[PDB]
Design a protein around this nucleic acid. Structure first.
Ligand SMILES: [Ca+2]
Ligand SMILES: [Ca+2]
Ligand SMILES: [Ca+2]
Ligand SMILES: [Cl-]
Ligand SMILES: [Cl-]
Ligand SMILES: [Cl-]
Ligand SMILES: [Cl-]
Lengths: 173, 173
DNA sequence: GATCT
DNA sequence: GTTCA
DNA sequence: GAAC
DNA sequence: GATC
């Protein structure tokens, strides 16, 4: 690249040659816990990633660790409390315009733009950890959320039921 | 305000009168589950919030739901898998410069700037849910993380021990 | 399509 | 103080 | 909202 | 990274 990056997220990868020093997926010690869930297909015209479902039964499963692999090289390990389709939706927020707006995460910008430029199909490996049962206010939950996030959700919903709206500082609808 | 806001996070609150239709903390239905944790003190000169620790034994406790209260009014309900100190430092990322850079969340920007402009001490009430025990790869955990986030941390730490670095797409140190 | 947490 | 997820 |  |  030719500019002085102020930060790592501004250094967009340029080609699969930038992955030359990465670790092979074969050398991933936890790989027996992972299965090939889906693939990502870069759509440069529409500045987004499309999905080809592979492990169709798991496409709506939530709470996963994922590995993005390009030509056998590990590009990224991440996670989501949502299904993979929503995590990809989130990556599709990494558009140039939104980075300019300051409304996307630097992570989503870095990854979306890198994958678009590398322009290869990305294999997505996933592991879905078992979810514990937990209690909050004499009610039991089993899901992908942290207990604090779930507690907040119940409390905010109740608040809206009781008061007809969220607090002014809770911006999201 | 006078500009055409493109989004809700750009509408910074200007004074306590902007809270006049908010719900009083005393009418909060879950108030019996919450206890005063700390106060936040706006420091406009330094464009940040300071902390007055109250519930000292809980200042390093992780996994909470919080309520920000200003002159009796509920401004916001939120949560953190970290201690309140770290959530506050995250709010301290809501600086004008960082918003211009696009490197802070719109949430942190909206809240920090609103709290600085209102310029009142904020009472922080908190509830710490009980943490369930759970198993990953035959090891037991009991913490504030979702199972997917913990699983990814465990996997990534092992990845670093094996290959001495993180994947290139994992930007954070 | 776009922002919020 | 400042960016990443 | 989590992390450096 | 979660959400609308
Ligand atoms: Ca992750
Ligand atoms: Ca009124
Ligand atoms: Ca929250
Ligand atoms: Cl969570
Ligand atoms: Cl309520
Ligand atoms: Cl600061
Ligand atoms: Cl490994």
């Amino acid at each position: 690249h030719e500019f002085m990056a102020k930060r790592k997220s501004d250094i967009i990868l340029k080609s699969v040659d930038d992955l030359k020093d990465e670790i092979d997926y074969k050398d991933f010690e936890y790989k027996e816990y992972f299965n090939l869930l889906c693939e990502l297909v870069p759509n440069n015209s529409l500045e987004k990633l499309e999905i080809n479902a592979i492990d169709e039964k798991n496409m709506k499963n939530e709470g996963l660790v994922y590995v993005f692999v390009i030509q056998g090289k590990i590009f990224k390990i991440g996670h989501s409390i949502t299904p993979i389709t929503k995590r990809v939706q989130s990556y599709n927020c990494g558009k140039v315009e939104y980075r300019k707006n300051g409304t996307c995460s630097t992570t989503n910008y870095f990854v979306l733009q890198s994958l678009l430029k590398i322009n290869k199909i990305v294999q997505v490996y996933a592991f879905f950890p078992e979810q514990p049962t937990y209690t909050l206010f004499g009610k039991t939950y089993q899901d992908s959320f942290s207990t604090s996030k779930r507690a907040e959700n119940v409390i905010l919903e109740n608040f809206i039921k009781n008061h007809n709206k969220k607090p002014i500082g809770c911006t999201q609808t």
